[PDB]
Short mmCIF file of C-alpha atoms and ligand atoms in Angstrom, two decimals:
data_model
loop_
_atom_site.label_atom_id
_atom_site.label_comp_id
_atom_site.label_asym_id
_atom_site.label_seq_id
_atom_site.Cartn_x
_atom_site.Cartn_y
_atom_site.Cartn_z
CA UNK A 11 -7.50 -5.78 119.94
CA UNK A 12 -7.92 -2.80 117.81
CA UNK A 13 -11.54 -3.38 116.71
CA UNK A 14 -12.24 -2.21 120.59
CA UNK A 15 -9.69 0.52 120.37
CA UNK A 16 -11.62 1.75 117.28
CA UNK A 17 -15.03 1.98 119.12
CA UNK A 18 -13.40 3.65 122.34
CA UNK A 19 -11.56 6.26 120.20
CA UNK A 20 -14.75 6.62 118.01
CA UNK A 21 -17.28 6.86 120.93
CA UNK A 22 -15.29 8.92 122.73
CA UNK A 23 -14.08 11.05 119.65
CA UNK A 24 -10.31 11.18 120.50
CA UNK A 25 -8.82 10.64 117.13
CA UNK A 26 -7.10 14.31 117.14
CA UNK A 27 -5.80 13.39 120.50
CA UNK A 28 -4.53 10.02 119.67
CA UNK A 29 -2.85 11.45 116.44
CA UNK A 30 -1.17 14.38 118.40
CA UNK A 31 0.50 11.52 120.70
CA UNK A 32 1.93 9.90 117.77
CA UNK A 33 3.10 13.09 116.59
CA UNK A 34 4.88 13.98 120.09
CA UNK A 35 6.47 10.50 120.07
CA UNK A 36 7.50 10.39 116.20
CA UNK A 37 11.55 10.47 115.49
CA UNK A 38 13.69 13.31 114.07
CA UNK A 39 16.51 12.79 112.47
CA UNK A 40 18.82 14.97 110.15
CA UNK A 41 17.75 15.92 106.53
CA UNK A 42 20.78 17.91 105.91
CA UNK A 43 21.25 16.78 102.11
CA UNK A 44 17.57 17.76 101.51
CA UNK A 45 18.13 21.31 103.06
CA UNK A 46 21.24 21.76 100.68
CA UNK A 47 20.72 24.99 98.54
CA UNK A 48 21.59 23.02 95.24
CA UNK A 49 18.66 20.41 96.06
CA UNK A 50 16.00 23.38 96.66
CA UNK A 51 14.36 22.66 93.21
CA UNK A 52 14.35 18.96 93.61
CA UNK A 53 11.57 18.90 96.84
CA UNK A 54 7.79 19.84 96.08
CA UNK A 55 7.39 21.17 99.78
CA UNK A 56 10.14 22.81 101.77
CA UNK A 57 8.88 20.81 104.88
CA UNK A 58 8.90 17.23 103.81
CA UNK A 59 12.28 16.30 103.56
CA UNK A 60 13.94 12.63 103.46
CA UNK A 61 16.24 11.69 106.67
CA UNK A 62 19.85 11.47 105.54
CA UNK A 63 20.09 7.85 106.79
CA UNK A 64 17.03 6.43 105.01
CA UNK A 65 17.09 8.37 101.70
CA UNK A 66 17.66 6.99 98.40
CA UNK A 67 20.65 8.06 96.20
CA UNK A 68 20.53 8.04 92.72
CA UNK A 69 24.03 6.82 91.26
CA UNK A 70 24.85 9.72 89.32
CA UNK A 71 28.12 11.50 90.55
CA UNK A 72 27.03 15.09 89.85
CA UNK A 73 23.90 15.11 92.18
CA UNK A 74 22.70 12.10 93.98
CA UNK A 75 19.37 13.65 95.42
CA UNK A 76 15.81 12.69 95.26
CA UNK A 77 13.19 13.10 97.83
CA UNK A 78 12.86 9.22 98.49
CA UNK A 79 13.13 7.29 101.44
CA UNK A 80 13.44 3.32 102.17
CA UNK A 81 10.97 1.96 104.79
CA UNK A 82 12.50 -1.24 105.71
CA UNK A 83 9.95 -3.30 107.70
CA UNK A 84 12.44 -6.27 109.49
CA UNK A 85 9.81 -8.50 110.84
CA UNK A 86 7.29 -8.01 107.92
CA UNK A 87 10.00 -8.58 105.37
CA UNK A 88 8.48 -5.53 103.52
CA UNK A 89 10.50 -2.73 101.71
CA UNK A 90 8.67 0.31 100.49
CA UNK A 91 10.69 3.72 98.59
CA UNK A 92 8.01 6.40 99.59
CA UNK A 93 8.55 9.35 97.32
CA UNK A 94 6.84 12.81 96.40
CA UNK A 95 5.07 12.97 93.15
CA UNK A 96 7.53 14.02 90.25
CA UNK A 97 8.35 17.55 89.73
CA UNK A 98 8.64 18.41 85.71
CA UNK A 99 12.40 18.47 86.45
CA UNK A 100 12.83 15.24 88.29
CA UNK A 101 10.69 12.87 86.10
CA UNK A 102 14.04 11.76 84.59
CA UNK A 103 15.24 11.43 88.44
CA UNK A 104 12.34 9.44 89.35
CA UNK A 105 12.76 6.93 86.21
CA UNK A 106 16.61 6.43 87.15
CA UNK A 107 15.42 5.53 90.98
CA UNK A 108 13.06 3.11 89.18
CA UNK A 109 15.52 1.54 87.12
CA UNK A 110 18.64 1.51 89.89
CA UNK A 111 16.47 0.10 92.71
CA UNK A 112 14.90 -2.73 90.38
CA UNK A 113 11.21 -1.86 91.38
CA UNK A 114 8.88 -3.97 89.62
CA UNK A 115 5.84 -1.59 90.77
CA UNK A 116 4.63 2.07 90.94
CA UNK A 117 1.86 2.89 92.84
CA UNK A 118 0.35 6.12 92.62
CA UNK A 119 -2.26 7.51 94.86
CA UNK A 120 -3.23 10.97 93.58
CA UNK A 121 -4.68 12.55 89.99
CA UNK A 122 -2.25 15.19 88.37
CA UNK A 123 -4.50 17.57 88.97
CA UNK A 124 -6.45 17.92 92.27
CA UNK A 125 -7.89 20.99 93.93
CA UNK A 126 -7.41 22.75 90.59
CA UNK A 127 -3.59 22.69 91.12
CA UNK A 128 -0.92 20.20 89.52
CA UNK A 129 0.01 17.63 92.28
CA UNK A 130 2.42 15.59 90.33
CA UNK A 131 4.01 15.96 86.76
CA UNK A 132 2.52 13.54 83.99
CA UNK A 133 5.46 11.04 83.78
CA UNK A 134 4.14 8.30 82.18
CA UNK A 135 2.94 8.36 78.28
CA UNK A 136 -0.69 8.73 77.29
CA UNK A 137 -0.64 6.80 74.29
CA UNK A 138 1.46 3.51 72.97
CA UNK A 139 2.52 5.26 69.87
CA UNK A 140 4.00 8.49 71.79
CA UNK A 141 6.91 7.45 74.24
CA UNK A 142 8.85 9.51 76.37
CA UNK A 143 12.68 10.06 76.26
CA UNK A 144 14.23 11.47 79.34
CA UNK A 145 17.49 12.93 77.90
CA UNK A 146 19.01 13.87 81.16
CA UNK A 147 19.08 10.09 82.45
CA UNK A 148 19.15 8.31 78.99
CA UNK A 149 15.66 6.10 79.44
CA UNK A 150 12.85 5.55 77.07
CA UNK A 151 9.70 4.67 78.57
CA UNK A 152 6.94 3.11 76.36
CA UNK A 153 3.11 2.47 77.31
CA UNK A 154 2.25 -0.96 76.19
CA UNK A 155 -1.10 -1.52 77.93
CA UNK A 156 -3.64 0.33 80.11
CA UNK A 157 -6.80 -1.45 81.84
CA UNK A 158 -9.13 1.03 83.32
CA UNK A 159 -11.27 0.32 85.93
CA UNK A 160 -14.10 1.99 87.89
CA UNK A 161 -11.70 2.76 90.94
CA UNK A 162 -8.16 2.35 89.55
CA UNK A 163 -5.77 1.88 86.44
CA UNK A 164 -3.06 -0.77 85.74
CA UNK A 165 -0.70 -0.03 83.00
CA UNK A 166 2.03 -2.16 81.66
CA UNK A 167 5.30 0.20 80.85
CA UNK A 168 8.74 -1.18 79.03
CA UNK A 169 11.29 1.07 80.45
CA UNK A 170 14.63 0.84 78.32
CA UNK A 171 17.90 1.89 79.30
CA UNK A 172 19.34 3.63 76.07
CA UNK A 173 23.08 3.28 77.33
CA UNK A 174 22.88 -0.78 77.94
CA UNK A 175 19.87 -1.49 75.98
CA UNK A 176 18.26 -3.48 78.60
CA UNK A 177 14.60 -3.53 79.06
CA UNK A 178 12.14 -3.87 82.13
CA UNK A 179 8.56 -4.13 82.35
CA UNK A 180 7.11 -1.90 84.96
CA UNK A 181 3.48 -2.17 86.30
CA UNK A 182 1.92 1.23 87.07
CA UNK A 183 -1.10 1.16 89.59
CA UNK A 184 -3.08 4.26 89.73
CA UNK A 185 -5.66 4.58 92.55
CA UNK A 186 -8.06 7.39 91.00
CA UNK A 187 -10.73 7.78 93.37
CA UNK A 188 -9.13 9.14 96.49
CA UNK A 189 -11.61 12.18 96.85
CA UNK A 190 -9.86 15.95 96.82
CA UNK A 191 -10.84 16.22 100.46
CA UNK A 192 -11.04 13.76 103.69
CA UNK A 193 -10.80 10.00 102.87
CA UNK A 194 -13.03 7.35 101.14
CA UNK A 195 -16.10 6.54 103.20
CA UNK A 196 -15.36 2.83 102.94
CA UNK A 197 -11.88 1.08 102.50
CA UNK A 198 -13.33 -1.80 100.37
CA UNK A 199 -12.00 -0.22 96.98
CA UNK A 200 -8.97 0.73 98.74
CA UNK A 201 -8.21 -2.92 100.07
CA UNK A 202 -9.04 -4.36 96.47
CA UNK A 203 -6.58 -2.11 95.09
CA UNK A 204 -3.95 -3.16 97.79
CA UNK A 205 -4.72 -6.86 96.94
CA UNK A 206 -4.26 -6.36 93.08
CA UNK A 207 -0.67 -4.72 93.86
CA UNK A 208 0.25 -7.93 96.07
CA UNK A 209 -1.13 -10.35 93.33
CA UNK A 210 1.11 -8.76 90.65
CA UNK A 211 4.13 -10.01 92.63
CA UNK A 212 5.44 -6.14 93.09
CA UNK A 213 5.80 -6.26 96.76
CA UNK A 214 7.48 -9.70 96.68
CA UNK A 215 11.67 -9.91 97.94
CA UNK A 216 12.38 -11.04 94.05
CA UNK A 217 12.13 -7.64 93.25
CA UNK A 218 13.66 -4.16 94.32
CA UNK A 219 10.83 -2.24 96.71
CA UNK A 220 7.67 -0.74 95.26
CA UNK A 221 7.77 2.78 94.56
CA UNK A 222 4.71 4.36 96.38
CA UNK A 223 3.67 8.05 95.76
CA UNK A 224 1.05 10.71 96.29
CA UNK A 225 2.10 14.66 96.35
CA UNK A 226 4.15 14.85 99.49
CA UNK A 227 4.75 11.03 99.82
CA UNK A 228 3.69 11.18 103.59
CA UNK A 229 -0.32 10.75 103.92
CA UNK A 230 -1.98 8.48 101.10
CA UNK A 231 1.47 6.68 100.95
CA UNK A 232 1.80 6.40 104.32
CA UNK A 233 -1.86 4.65 104.81
CA UNK A 234 -0.67 2.32 101.72
CA UNK A 235 2.22 1.03 103.74
CA UNK A 236 0.70 1.04 107.03
CA UNK A 237 -2.12 -1.26 105.91
CA UNK A 238 -0.02 -3.77 103.85
CA UNK A 239 2.53 -4.16 106.67
CA UNK A 240 -0.06 -4.39 109.65
CA UNK A 241 -2.12 -7.29 107.62
CA UNK A 242 1.17 -8.93 106.69
CA UNK A 243 2.12 -9.26 110.24
CA UNK A 244 -1.37 -10.55 111.37
CA UNK A 245 -0.47 -13.31 108.87
CA UNK A 246 2.92 -14.08 110.57
CA UNK A 247 2.27 -13.97 114.19
CA UNK A 248 0.92 -16.43 116.68
CA UNK A 249 -1.73 -14.15 118.06
CA UNK A 250 -2.99 -11.60 115.06
CA UNK A 251 -4.21 -9.15 117.88
CA UNK A 252 -1.02 -8.54 119.25
CA UNK A 253 -0.57 -6.16 116.07
CA UNK A 254 -0.53 -2.51 117.56
CA UNK A 255 -1.09 0.02 114.38
CA UNK A 256 0.33 2.93 116.63
CA UNK A 257 3.61 1.14 117.14
CA UNK A 258 3.81 -0.07 113.29
CA UNK A 259 3.14 3.52 112.38
CA UNK A 260 6.02 4.93 114.86
CA UNK A 261 8.48 2.20 113.70
CA UNK A 262 7.60 3.54 109.65
CA UNK A 263 8.17 7.09 110.73
CA UNK A 264 11.71 6.19 111.76
CA UNK A 265 12.02 6.14 107.99
CA UNK A 266 10.16 9.00 106.65
CA UNK A 267 8.60 11.95 108.48
CA UNK A 268 5.11 12.76 108.84
CA UNK A 269 3.44 9.57 107.56
CA UNK A 270 -0.23 9.70 108.26
CA UNK A 271 -1.04 13.70 107.62
CA UNK A 272 -4.36 13.63 109.39
CA UNK A 273 -6.48 12.06 111.96
CA UNK A 274 -8.76 11.19 109.06
CA UNK A 275 -6.25 9.15 107.45
CA UNK A 276 -5.23 7.53 111.14
CA UNK A 277 -9.09 6.48 111.33
CA UNK A 278 -9.14 5.17 107.48
CA UNK A 279 -6.14 3.35 108.33
CA UNK A 280 -7.59 1.26 111.43
CA UNK A 281 -10.74 0.80 109.20
CA UNK A 282 -8.67 -0.58 106.34
CA UNK A 283 -6.74 -2.79 108.86
CA UNK A 284 -9.84 -4.30 110.69
CA UNK A 285 -12.00 -4.73 107.29
CA UNK A 286 -8.55 -6.51 105.78
CA UNK A 287 -8.30 -8.60 108.67
CA UNK A 288 -11.87 -10.22 107.99
CA UNK A 289 -10.66 -11.12 104.20
CA UNK A 290 -7.29 -12.69 105.99
CA UNK A 291 -9.03 -15.05 108.72
C1 JGD B 803 10.25 23.43 93.29
N1 JGD B 803 8.97 23.26 92.63
C2 JGD B 803 7.64 23.16 93.29
C3 JGD B 803 9.17 23.14 91.22
C4 JGD B 803 9.77 23.54 90.57
C5 JGD B 803 9.66 23.31 88.85
N2 JGD B 803 8.55 23.43 88.54
C6 JGD B 803 7.64 23.54 89.06
C7 JGD B 803 7.70 23.82 90.55
#
C-alpha cells in the first residue's frame, strides 16, 4: 500500500532517490520528426519532444507536426493528448488538433504569465463579442460563457469549421491557482478540479481524448493524468492496493518523455491519489 510507502519515503526523505530511479528506468524512443529543422519553430523547448510512435499528426499535407503525444492507458480505458502550451504561431495548429481528434475538453494547468514570462499564447477569446479566426486552419472560436471560481475557471467555447460550417461545443477547464514555484500545499482544490472534468463527460470514451497542457506538457500535465488513471484503476481492480503509482508513471512515460518533472510533483501525485482514494472508498 502507497500510504505506507508515502510515510517510508517521507520519514526517510528519499523523494529525490525514488525520482532518480524513475528517471533511469524510463523509456527512450526516437523523436526524429520533432528535431527536423522545419519543425524548429513549432517547439517551445528544444529538450521536450514527442516520440515518433505516439505523436499526434495534423491532417494537413504541408507539415503534420505538433508537439503533442497520445497517452493510451489500456487497462484504465483512458486516453489523453498531452501537449505544450501553444505558441503564437501554433494556436491554429492546436485548434486543428482539437477539431481532428474530436476532443470535448481542454485542460489548462498554467497561467499565460508566470515568473514574469509568457508560458502560453492567449489561444481563446476574452469576450463573447470578440471571436478569434485562425486563417491558417480555417477555424472560428467563440466564447459562449465563462464561470470564474476561486481555484479554476470553466469556459464554454464554440469551435466552427469555416470549410464545412460544422460547430462543436468545447469545454475549457482552466486551473488558475497552481503556484509559480513548488506544488499546492493540499491536493483538495486539484481533486475538486479533476472531479469537475470527469463530471463534464470530457474523459469519456464517447469523445476523442481530452487535451491536457501546462507550459511543456510534462510536469503539471503529468500529475493530472497520473492521478486520474491511478484513481480509475483503484475503482476497477479487485484489490485497490495493487495499484503502484511508480509502475503507472513508467507506463505513461512510454508515450511522452519526462512526465512529472520534480520530486515535489511525484510527492504531490502520491498525496492526490492517497486523498482521492478516500472519496473513492
Ligand atoms: C520557438 N519559440 C519559443 C517561439 C516561436 C515564436 N514566437 C515565440 C517563441
